[PDB]
Structure 1
Amino acid sequence: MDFPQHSQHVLEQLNQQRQLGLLCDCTFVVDGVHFKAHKAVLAACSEYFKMLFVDQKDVVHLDISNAAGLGQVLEFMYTAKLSLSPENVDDVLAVATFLQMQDIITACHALKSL
Structure 2
Amino acid sequence: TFSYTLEDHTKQAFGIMNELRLSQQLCDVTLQVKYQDAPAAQFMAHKVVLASSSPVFKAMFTNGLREQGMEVVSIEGIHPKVMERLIEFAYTASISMGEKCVLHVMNGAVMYQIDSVVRACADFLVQQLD
Q: Name the TM-score, length of structure 2 as normaliser.
A: 0.79
Structure in which a larger fraction of residues adopt helix: 1
The C-alpha deviation readout for 1:59-102, integer Å capped at 9, x for no partner, is 53223321111111111111111114321111111111110111
Task: Choose 37-46 or 24-33, whichever is displaced more.
Answer: 24-33
Cα distance, 1:45 vs structure 2: 0.4
Which residue matches 1:43? Answer: 51
CA contact (8 A) 1:64 1:98 kept: no
1:75 paired residue number: 88
Matched residue count: 114
Q: Distance in 1 between matches of 2:58 and 2:116?
A: 16
> Which residue of structure 2 lines up, in the alignment, with residue 33 of structure 1?
41
User: Percent identity over the alignment?
Assistant: 29
The corresponding residue for 1:92 is: 105
Larger Rg: 2
- Tell me which stretches of 4 or more aligned residues in structure 1 moved more than 6 Å: none
Aligned to 2:12: 9
Unaligned runs of 5+ in 1: none
Question: Cα RMSD (Å) of the superposition?
Answer: 1.7
Q: Deviations over 1:41-67 (max 9, x none)?
A: 000000001111112485532233211
State the TM-score, normalized to the length of structure 1: 0.90
SS in 1 for 2:78: coil
Q: Which runs of 5+ in 2 are unaligned?
A: 35-39
